[PDB]
Amino acid sequence: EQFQLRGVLWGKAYSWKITGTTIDKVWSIVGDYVRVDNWVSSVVKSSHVVSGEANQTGCVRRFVCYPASEGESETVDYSELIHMNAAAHQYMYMIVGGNITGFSLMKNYVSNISLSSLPEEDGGGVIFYWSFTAEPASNLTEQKCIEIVFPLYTTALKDLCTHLSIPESSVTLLD
């Protein structure tokens, strides 16, 4: 009959409907965690595992991003896979280092990806769930985090279509 208060979190969750594809096809790109360069290829130049075994829980990926603008340097993201369930097409990760533009500003950025199949009889398709949280800190606001994260998710959904060779119209942001 007692309890201990914890800190509150910032963040937001997004869901897209994707037609003209299957959970396996989406996963073949999105599920290769340590080769994110083969997914968000418009932002990410290269990626490889630097700790643990590729795509296994606890592993760390290091990926390199193209310069944010001309003159600026490439930036780096280290992120740990903190939960992986490939059979259930879902995983969870956190940035544990690097100077990746914007994302490296957040405190304990944690992200969740979940894929689901819509019923066969409803025309199939995939529900792509993608959320993040970050801890409140004085150099940011929740609104500023959203302005960092959401545009990237949007780009990644576009880059997904490119790699799937399906039109961008295949993707609809729910709500």
Residues near a copy of itself, by CB under 8 A: 1-13, 15, 17, 23, 50-51, 57-58, 60, 62, 76, 78, 80-83, 85, 88-90, 92, 94, 96-98, 112, 114-119, 122-123, 127, 129, 131, 133, 172, 174-175
CA 42 to chain centre: 14
For residue 143, the minimal CB distance to a copy of itself (Å) is 12
For residue 9, the minimal CB distance to a copy of itself (Å) is 5
Nearer to a copy of itself, 16 or 39 (CB): 16
For residue 99, the minimal CB distance to a copy of itself (Å) is 9
For residue 107, the minimal CB distance to a copy of itself (Å) is 12
Q: Strand ranges (DSSP E) for the chain?
A: 10-18, 44-51, 60-65, 75-85, 90-98, 107-117, 126-135, 171-173
Tokens of 45: 């130049």
Residue type, 130: W
Rounded distance between C-alpha atoms, residue 17 and residue 88, angstroms: 18
